[PDB]
Amino acid sequence: EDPPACGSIVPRREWRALASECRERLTRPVRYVVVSHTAGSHCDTPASCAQQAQNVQSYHVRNLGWCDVGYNFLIGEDGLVYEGRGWNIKGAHAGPTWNPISIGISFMGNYMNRVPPPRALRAAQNLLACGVALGALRSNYEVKGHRDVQPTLSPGDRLYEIIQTWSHYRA
Amino acid sequence: EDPPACGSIVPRREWRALASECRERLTRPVRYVVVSHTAGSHCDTPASCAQQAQNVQSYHVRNLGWCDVGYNFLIGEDGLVYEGRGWNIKGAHAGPTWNPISIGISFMGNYMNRVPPPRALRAAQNLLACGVALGALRSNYEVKGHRDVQPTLSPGDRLYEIIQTWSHYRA
Amino acid sequence: EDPPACGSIVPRREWRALASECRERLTRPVRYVVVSHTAGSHCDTPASCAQQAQNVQSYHVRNLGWCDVGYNFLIGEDGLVYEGRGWNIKGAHAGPTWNPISIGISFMGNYMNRVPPPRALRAAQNLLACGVALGALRSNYEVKGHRDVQPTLSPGDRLYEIIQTWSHYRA
Amino acid sequence: EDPPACGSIVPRREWRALASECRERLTRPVRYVVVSHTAGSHCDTPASCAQQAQNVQSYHVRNLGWCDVGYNFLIGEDGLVYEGRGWNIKGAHAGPTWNPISIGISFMGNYMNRVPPPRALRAAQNLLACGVALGALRSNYEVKGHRDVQPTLSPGDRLYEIIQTWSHYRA
């Protein structure tokens, strides 16, 4: 069980997230990853991305009344990964059939007419390899675009175009 | 008076829907109505709008594997309401919490920077008044925009903006 | 903050409850409700049920040494709700994870082989709407079986099966 | 279904009620509430009280030829409310003047020399509060006694006396 400190993941406390009230768990190893975009604005710096993650959480917790931000992880264009509900807590990002069997990661921004920068993508891929290293994800895990399991424009055309070219993508 | 007196809808056969396989049912009268937009292209004729309703339905059934198009009713810019799951079948448009206690109506098109023409709006409000008359909806029913209960841009800024003005809208 | 009082709860002074030595409070609005059964004797008259409440309180206090009867509320088969620690005080019924973020209501009886009467079910369902109306429970509160947050049979197979039908239920 | 009667009312069916033949609706918002005692036998358990509601209905239907039991609601010493004609139907409880303008709630038993239980008092308020919530009782509703409007002794001296101590009551 060789140890990799692959957590180039910014903790909840570090981006000053509100405390979570979610308690239901994901049984590891999880088989799926559903990729979405927030459809909101992007951020290209730890400082702005921290705030942007606060806003997304805000919307979900204050406006929608949820126990925590809906994603397990969020990707910023600053090239960092933000801890959402994490590897062990069931997200609220792709429905009742998919949330309990998937890890939901969301790129912060709107990708209908923009590609996320290479470092945002490297962070996403690095985050999945990590999940595999830890046994949080099956080594043969499958990636889905949010539009493949729920009716939505998410994760955006350009971004959707890209994940389809991904090794673990299966529609 | 009686027996009926309510707004008109294009029936499933008329638009050429595949047969529904959905079985789960809503309890009447329903307290909530959720307004979304399909987020795709719009249609301003009975011909293109039926075609449109086909597509949306194809995506939900052929691609997401659902028993039927997600919405209870669709609204075209042609001025006609399109039968979806109807007043009795639980739809799949606003998630596990609202699907079983609401009627999901979705305008066909994207209303982020565009508003639906007056006739599409009359159709939608006609429909709600129809639903009330049928006892399918409570007389003190409430309207929510899709974004008020799910993380999404739906029903679109301009549309969402419009429904905030409605007699039955409740944030 | 929300003027009108609610439901028909038999207050403490009426079922002759020992004073409470509990002080740790709950952050309102509470998100979860965990349904349990006492697994003790059932009662179907105000007098026998007032007694049973007393029995349950006393056993938690005198024998287990708890600051007050562990449940936030108790339900009789006489169809009445019995005030336990109430809405503002943290209770001891579902473990350290859940006790600070939930409301615990217990049906006085054993429900492995008996279903409680409709009036008991009704009293519970109505106690919850009160909780919301009062602002003690979130409008989108979630009900969980005792067994879905702990290893146990509680609230009993029959009662468990029932609450799985309630609209605010989440496994 | 999913919405049960507010304030834990025992449904017509639970107390084994004969079907109603009444058609005369009252148009809520009703302005008044009249309190009578049935002058019949009292009961303090859910079992005995269901028989009494059945007793009183039978008397009114089989013997007086009425379309249903006189009252809109009956209160029990068990602390439960019993559905009579409900909110919508005009009841026969206080003559040709007040039957069309008020809601008749009747305490089961003779209360000339008996003061009824506080739980039954709580259930009564509970009934009136949930009446407003429904749109049946005008939010600013008013209360009168049976003897305040007819040559009768009902609701009984002890019972009548406390009804005056009320808030919503109008002299």
Side-chain angles (χ1 to χ4, degrees):
Chain A
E1 68 278 70
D2 289 345
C6 60
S8 223
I9 291 169
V10 178
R12 299 180 65 92
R13 194 143 260 147
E14 197 176 300
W15 55 265
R16 296 166 22 186
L18 287 161
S20 159
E21 299 187 17
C22 314
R23 296 296 188 265
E24 220 190 313
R25 308 179 70 77
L26 271 182
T27 70
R28 60 166 70 203
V30 179
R31 183 181 197 203
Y32 300 94
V33 176
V34 181
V35 188
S36 60
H37 72 3
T38 58
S41 18
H42 36 137
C43 55
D44 54 7
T45 78
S48 49
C49 280
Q51 173 84 75
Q52 196 52 56
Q54 273 163 59
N55 300 329
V56 176
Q57 186 194 42
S58 193
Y59 171 35
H60 296 194
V61 179
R62 300 207 174 94
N63 300 334
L64 301 185
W66 289 352
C67 55
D68 182 28
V69 57
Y71 317 110
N72 298 275
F73 297 105
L74 297 100
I75 315 298
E77 302 202 340
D78 61 353
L80 305 179
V81 173
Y82 293 74
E83 177 182 35
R85 299 203 178 175
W87 298 113
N88 322 132
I89 299 294
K90 184 163 63 66
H93 52 86
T97 279
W98 296 95
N99 307 330
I101 57 184
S102 73
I103 282 297
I105 83 180
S106 190
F107 293 72
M108 297 187 286
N110 192 290
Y111 302 98
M112 278 302 290
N113 297 284
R114 293 183 74 243
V115 278
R119 64 194 175 244
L121 298 165
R122 286 193 299 279
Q125 298 277 78
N126 182 37
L127 168 71
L128 301 179
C130 185
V132 177
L134 296 174
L137 297 177
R138 288 174 201 196
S139 39
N140 80 314
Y141 72 87
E142 298 179 45
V143 182
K144 299 280 183 129
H146 194 195
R147 62 178 56 177
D148 300 326
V149 297
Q150 281 216 302
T152 168
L153 275 186
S154 166
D157 285 357
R158 303 296 166 250
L159 180 32
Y160 182 73
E161 228 162 271
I162 297 165
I163 61 167
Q164 287 192 296
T165 74
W166 286 5
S167 175
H168 288 74
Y169 180 87
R170 179 164 123 193
Chain B
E1 321 297 78
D2 289 307
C6 99
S8 270
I9 309 155
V10 173
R12 300 185 60 96
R13 267 262 300 159
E14 196 170 298
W15 59 269
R16 294 190 85 248
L18 286 140
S20 156
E21 267 194 43
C22 305
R23 312 197 86 286
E24 303 187 283
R25 312 165 55 86
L26 291 169
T27 309
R28 82 158 53 194
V30 174
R31 185 170 309 273
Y32 305 101
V33 168
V34 185
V35 179
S36 63
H37 72 356
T38 61
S41 23
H42 40 105
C43 55
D44 62 346
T45 78
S48 47
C49 272
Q51 180 65 67
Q52 188 67 252
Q54 247 154 288
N55 308 324
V56 178
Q57 193 217 33
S58 190
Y59 168 44
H60 298 193
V61 178
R62 292 294 198 229
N63 295 180
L64 310 175
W66 291 349
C67 54
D68 180 23
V69 60
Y71 317 116
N72 293 278
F73 302 92
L74 307 98
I75 316 273
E77 300 201 3
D78 61 2
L80 317 166
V81 181
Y82 287 81
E83 199 187 13
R85 296 202 177 182
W87 296 114
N88 319 115
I89 302 301
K90 191 195 71 159
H93 55 87
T97 297
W98 299 86
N99 287 336
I101 62 172
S102 73
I103 280 303
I105 89 168
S106 174
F107 282 74
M108 299 182 142
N110 198 291
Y111 303 107
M112 275 299 293
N113 40 30
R114 170 210 193 79
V115 304
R119 44 177 197 277
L121 298 175
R122 285 186 301 270
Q125 304 211 241
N126 220 43
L127 181 72
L128 297 171
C130 164
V132 168
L134 291 179
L137 287 176
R138 293 196 163 281
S139 59
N140 60 331
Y141 79 82
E142 298 180 15
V143 175
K144 314 267 186 207
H146 190 190
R147 65 174 54 160
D148 294 318
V149 316
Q150 291 299 65
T152 165
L153 280 188
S154 159
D157 295 333
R158 305 295 245 96
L159 180 49
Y160 181 72
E161 199 181 315
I162 280 169
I163 60 179
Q164 294 191 261
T165 74
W166 293 5
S167 162
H168 284 68
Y169 181 92
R170 201 175 199 193
Chain C
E1 292 182 27
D2 289 295
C6 197
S8 280
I9 298 168
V10 181
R12 312 178 68 98
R13 317 298 219 98
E14 193 175 315
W15 57 267
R16 308 170 182 190
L18 286 166
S20 169
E21 295 294 302
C22 298
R23 299 294 210 261
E24 246 146 44
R25 281 170 93 91
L26 275 180
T27 299
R28 290 159 39 103
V30 170
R31 180 175 296 277
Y32 306 92
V33 181
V34 186
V35 177
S36 70
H37 74 325
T38 64
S41 295
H42 68 76
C43 49
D44 58 17
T45 71
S48 50
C49 274
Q51 177 67 66
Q52 210 51 43
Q54 211 154 18
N55 277 5
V56 179
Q57 168 176 54
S58 151
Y59 171 69
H60 283 156
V61 182
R62 306 286 184 65
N63 289 357
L64 284 177
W66 297 346
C67 61
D68 186 18
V69 62
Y71 308 112
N72 290 284
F73 292 99
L74 293 101
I75 311 282
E77 295 193 344
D78 61 350
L80 307 172
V81 166
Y82 293 82
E83 201 192 356
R85 302 199 188 182
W87 299 117
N88 316 307
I89 316 302
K90 189 189 87 127
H93 51 73
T97 306
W98 300 92
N99 291 308
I101 53 172
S102 70
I103 288 296
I105 78 186
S106 206
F107 276 79
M108 292 185 285
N110 190 318
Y111 302 105
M112 292 294 326
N113 303 307
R114 291 183 73 243
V115 301
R119 51 176 184 278
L121 296 176
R122 274 201 299 292
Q125 283 165 302
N126 268 296
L127 162 70
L128 303 196
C130 269
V132 172
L134 278 180
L137 290 172
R138 305 187 64 90
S139 77
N140 60 327
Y141 73 92
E142 296 176 49
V143 203
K144 296 212 186 285
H146 190 176
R147 61 169 74 178
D148 309 326
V149 302
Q150 278 192 341
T152 176
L153 305 151
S154 188
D157 289 2
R158 302 300 188 271
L159 171 45
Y160 181 68
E161 275 162 23
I162 296 160
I163 75 195
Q164 282 194 299
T165 68
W166 295 6
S167 61
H168 278 72
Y169 181 81
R170 303 282 181 271
Chain D
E1 334 301 302
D2 65 297
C6 43
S8 302
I9 295 159
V10 179
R12 290 180 64 72
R13 283 195 55 153
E14 187 177 310
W15 63 261
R16 296 188 44 97
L18 297 165
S20 168
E21 315 289 317
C22 314
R23 340 234 172 213
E24 276 186 292
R25 302 185 86 66
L26 299 146
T27 289
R28 27 156 206 214
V30 173
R31 298 202 37 179
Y32 302 106
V33 169
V34 184
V35 176
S36 69
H37 79 325
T38 60
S41 288
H42 55 100
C43 50
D44 65 342
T45 80
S48 47
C49 280
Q51 190 64 61
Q52 205 38 49
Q54 226 209 315
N55 274 16
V56 166
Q57 179 189 58
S58 197
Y59 181 57
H60 290 185
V61 168
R62 279 182 225 267
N63 302 334
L64 315 162
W66 293 358
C67 56
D68 190 355
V69 49
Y71 326 93
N72 296 289
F73 297 102
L74 301 66
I75 310 301
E77 294 196 325
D78 48 17
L80 318 182
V81 178
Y82 291 77
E83 194 196 20
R85 295 196 196 191
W87 298 108
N88 315 323
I89 314 299
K90 181 196 97 133
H93 51 85
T97 294
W98 307 78
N99 281 343
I101 72 175
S102 66
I103 270 285
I105 65 157
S106 202
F107 288 77
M108 292 203 299
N110 176 303
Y111 299 103
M112 275 280 310
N113 295 108
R114 274 205 125 227
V115 296
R119 58 176 157 284
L121 303 194
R122 279 199 312 288
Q125 334 262 39
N126 191 42
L127 171 74
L128 299 175
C130 132
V132 167
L134 269 256
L137 275 165
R138 74 193 221 147
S139 350
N140 38 301
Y141 85 74
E142 312 181 58
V143 171
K144 311 275 175 182
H146 195 179
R147 72 169 53 143
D148 282 350
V149 304
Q150 213 150 84
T152 191
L153 266 178
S154 135
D157 304 355
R158 304 339 193 4
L159 168 42
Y160 180 60
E161 77 199 6
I162 41 171
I163 276 285
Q164 319 225 289
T165 64
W166 284 24
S167 93
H168 262 69
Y169 179 84
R170 261 56 161 166

